Amino acid sequence: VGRRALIVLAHSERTSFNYAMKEAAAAALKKKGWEVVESDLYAMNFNPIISRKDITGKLKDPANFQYPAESVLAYKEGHLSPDIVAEQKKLEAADLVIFQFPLQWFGVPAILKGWFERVFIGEFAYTYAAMYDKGPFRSKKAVLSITTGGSGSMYSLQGIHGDMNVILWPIQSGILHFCGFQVLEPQLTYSIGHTPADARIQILEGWKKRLENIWDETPLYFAPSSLFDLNFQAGFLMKKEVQDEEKNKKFGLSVGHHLGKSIPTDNQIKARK
Amino acid sequence: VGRRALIVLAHSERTSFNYAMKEAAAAALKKKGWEVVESDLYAMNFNPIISRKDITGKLKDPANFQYPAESVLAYKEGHLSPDIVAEQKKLEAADLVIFQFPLQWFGVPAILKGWFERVFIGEFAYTYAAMYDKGPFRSKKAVLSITTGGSGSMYSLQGIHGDMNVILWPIQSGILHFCGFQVLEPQLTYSIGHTPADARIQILEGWKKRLENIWDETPLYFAPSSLFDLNFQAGFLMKKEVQDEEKNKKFGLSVGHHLGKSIPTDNQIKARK
Numbered sequence: 001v002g003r004r005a006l007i008v009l010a011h012s013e014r015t016s017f018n019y020a021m022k023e024a025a026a027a028a029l030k031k032k033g034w035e036v037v038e039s040d041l042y043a044m045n046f047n048p049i050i051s052r053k054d055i056t057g058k059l060k061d062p063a064n065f066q067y068p069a070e071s072v073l074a075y076k077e078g079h080l081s082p083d084i085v086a087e088q089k090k091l092e093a094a095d096l097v098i099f100q101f102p103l104q105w106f107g108v109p110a111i112l113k114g115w116f117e118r119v120f121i122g123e124f125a126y127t128y129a130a131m132y133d134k135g136p137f138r139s140k141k142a143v144l145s146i147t148t149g150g151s152g153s154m155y156s157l158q159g160i161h162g163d164m165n166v167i168l169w170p171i172q173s174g175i176l177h178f179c180g181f182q183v184l185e186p187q188l189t190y191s192i193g194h195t196p197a198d199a200r201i202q203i204l205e206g207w208k209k210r211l212e213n214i215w216d217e218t219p220l221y222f223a224p225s226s227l228f229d230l231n232f233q234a235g236f237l238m239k240k241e242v243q244d245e246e247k248n249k250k251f252g253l254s255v256g257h258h259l260g261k262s263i264p265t266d267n268q269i270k271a272r273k
Numbered sequence: 274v275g276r277r278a279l280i281v282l283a284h285s286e287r288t289s290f291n292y293a294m295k296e297a298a299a300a301a302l303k304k305k306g307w308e309v310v311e312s313d314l315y316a317m318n319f320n321p322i323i324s325r326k327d328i329t330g331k332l333k334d335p336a337n338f339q340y341p342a343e344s345v346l347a348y349k350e351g352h353l354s355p356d357i358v359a360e361q362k363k364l365e366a367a368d369l370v371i372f373q374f375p376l377q378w379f380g381v382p383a384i385l386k387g388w389f390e391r392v393f394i395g396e397f398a399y400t401y402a403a404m405y406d407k408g409p410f411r412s413k414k415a416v417l418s419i420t421t422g423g424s425g426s427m428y429s430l431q432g433i434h435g436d437m438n439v440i441l442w443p444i445q446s447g448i449l450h451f452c453g454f455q456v457l458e459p460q461l462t463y464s465i466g467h468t469p470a471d472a473r474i475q476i477l478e479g480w481k482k483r484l485e486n487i488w489d490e491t492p493l494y495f496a497p498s499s500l501f502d503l504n505f506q507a508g509f510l511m512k513k514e515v516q517d518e519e520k521n522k523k524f525g526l527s528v529g530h531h532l533g534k535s536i537p538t539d540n541q542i543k544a545r546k
């Protein structure tokens with residue numbers, strides 16, 4: 001079960017429906033006994049740019065500065081900047097991580113992206129030796145709560161923007177699952193800019209209604225890492241037994257692991273029935 | 274033909290391969306008669322966070338602030354933040370926009386994502402009435418030049434990161450193609466952190482070659498806007514006649530337009546033969 005929950009919001013206006021959603025989640029989660037902690041990126045005036053200032057003290061190779069190594073080193077010896085360390089503290093303690101933000105240019109707002117690049121340091125959020133399903137945040141569950149200007153049909157298979165599942169992949173898979181996170185069904189609240197009041201009220205209440213049991217939900221599907229040869233010799237390719245056995249399957253495994261076949265419907269929006 | 278190019282660099286180190294790719298692209302482009310203009314985001318101390326300070330004027334509704342509407346008005350009247358106006362001015366002048374950068378968390382660097390969000394302002398870079406191929410930059414050609422830590426076999430259909438094509442989709446369709454840009458094939462340089470010295474030199478060399486005739490190449494394939502009814506009524510869905518006609522094609526039109534079928538090989542990486 002979960003006790004602690006971290007809500008990371010990415011939005012400047014407090015009058016925004018996004019801000020409303022964050023409160024709605026804290027309210028609802030508290031009532032159920034969760035200890036909520038917040039990360040109001042804009043309110044915290046968070047720094048989204050990685051640089052040799054995230055490492056406090058002498059770098060190992062000042063001439064040739066390599067962010068990864070330096071910050072992995074800094075994490076180990078305790079020289080990460082206070083603000084990055086702070087966020088890594090909330091996370092370390094969180095069981096459930098909610099990401100609330102408006103969809104911008106088909107991704108997380110720049111400030112949220114920067115948050116990941118700085119907070120998710122190696123050794124802390126990931127190691128090559130244990131990527132994906134075997135990562136550090138594997139004991140935690142995360143969730144995207146996105147708001148979009150476009151209608152949900154623009155994001156449908158025949159939608160002019162294309163399958164919302166492809167858009168989601170880079171984030172739920174590339175960023176979240178790559179660290180061990182169990183990714184729950186995203187809370188997609190389409191066309192918010194064109195939703196009436198009564199409709200908007202209901203939305204909030206639904207989000208809260210969902211959050212009262214968010215933890216017992218079955219997570220989205222991702223190809224287990226046991227299906228690959230996680231060694232460089234193999235180039236991290238999908239095991240030969242698996243490759244062959246999968247050939248009789250009409251559907252691929254996930255959006256990313258489509259194998260040039262048919263992507264399973266809503267692989268990134270709905271958890272396996 | 275093109276006489277003006279804009280090279281956008283998103284890396285903090287001048288000792289970096291990315292910075293070297295940036296010099297190569299200019300030295301090559303200029304030598305062939307181009308007028309190169311750069312935007313070294315980091316070197317510029319570029320602010321990636323969209324806020325109201327981006328609008329130096331009287332907001333239409335300061336109480337309930339909304340970046341889209343407010344940012345557009347600022348562009349129309351002319352009180353946008355000087356730095357942004359400076360950028361946009363580089364984009365009106367460019368025929369070719371090159372985006373040099375290290376793939377990070379399966380996407381563009383936060384600072385770069387900030388750039389799109391602040392500079393690509395409605396009316397300037399796009400309008401709902403003119404989505405995609407009808408966009409304002411339809412006479413411009415863009416190209417992503419990405420380097421990664423991971424081996425190309427990791428981004429293979431069988432790789433543990435999944436089809437690289439899915440990862441590139443959000444950027445090339447969502448951000449660049451939405452604005453009208455014709456997207457050229459992405460110059461992908463996998464595991465640059467493992468490439469031998471001689472190959473690194475060849476990669477630089479090769480990059481300079483392609484650049485020689487980068488403007489006559491055939492662009493990546495996107496579903497033309499003419500395949501969709503583009504009115505909030507019909508839901509911006511793919512026309513009826515069109516749907517029925519595609520029922521007979523083995524492959525989907527693109528990554529985000531796979532229509533549940535197989536995705537055409539390297540739809541977002543290789544142009545059509």
Ligand SMILES: Cc1cc2nc3c(=O)[nH]c(=O)nc-3n(C[C@H](O)[C@H](O)[C@H](O)COP(=O)(O)OP(=O)(O)OC[C@H]3O[C@@H](n4cnc5c(N)ncnc54)[C@H](O)[C@@H]3O)c2cc1C
Nearest residue numbers: 016017018020102103104105106147148149150200340341
């Ligand atoms: C840079 C940028 C990039 C974008 N890129 C994309 C993109 O790629 N794809 C896309 O689809 N969209 C995109 N958008 C649109 C964006 O996703 C939406 O404008 C945003 O998600 C709307 O969320 P909001 O809360 O900020 O809305 P806010 O406008 O009275 O408001 C929505 C409504 O909620 C109401 N409201 C506020 N609080 C409450 C409350 N407590 N209870 C009830 N009602 C309330 C408001 O009054 C308002 O009418 C982009 C916008 C920007 C600025």
Ligand SMILES: Cc1cc2nc3c(=O)[nH]c(=O)nc-3n(C[C@H](O)[C@H](O)[C@H](O)COP(=O)(O)OP(=O)(O)OC[C@H]3O[C@@H](n4cnc5c(N)ncnc54)[C@H](O)[C@@H]3O)c2cc1C
Nearest residue numbers: 117288289290291293375376377378379420421422423473
């Ligand atoms: C937050 C974050 C997220 C990341 N996410 C991902 C991801 O999702 N997927 C992924 O695959 N990778 C990822 N990476 C790894 C990243 O993509 C690579 O480290 C980066 O692209 C390497 O490019 P560089 O220009 O910095 O390299 P730089 O290390 O001697 O160097 C590359 C090589 O080029 C050499 N070199 C430098 N200048 C020159 C020159 N002028 N001529 C010839 N050789 C030269 C260098 O000495 C070096 O050996 C991530 C890194 C970070 C920090």
Ligand SMILES: O=C1Oc2ccccc2C(=O)C1CC1C(=O)Oc2ccccc2C1=O
Nearest residue numbers: 105106149150151154193401402447451505
């Ligand atoms: O809110 C909208 O209003 C519209 C009205 C008429 C016709 C089409 C649209 C849209 O596609 C969107 C969504 C939308 C938006 O509000 O902002 C964006 C910024 C960058 C890229 C994509 C988008 C969008 O798809």
Ligand SMILES: O=C1Oc2ccccc2C(=O)C1CC1C(=O)Oc2ccccc2C1=O
Nearest residue numbers: 128129174178378379421422423424427466
């Ligand atoms: O350097 C990286 O940093 C990352 C940061 C966030 C998300 C993804 C990645 C990566 O895929 C790689 C590539 C990557 C690499 O450069 O070296 C390796 C060595 C052994 C096993 C696996 C790998 C990798 O996946």
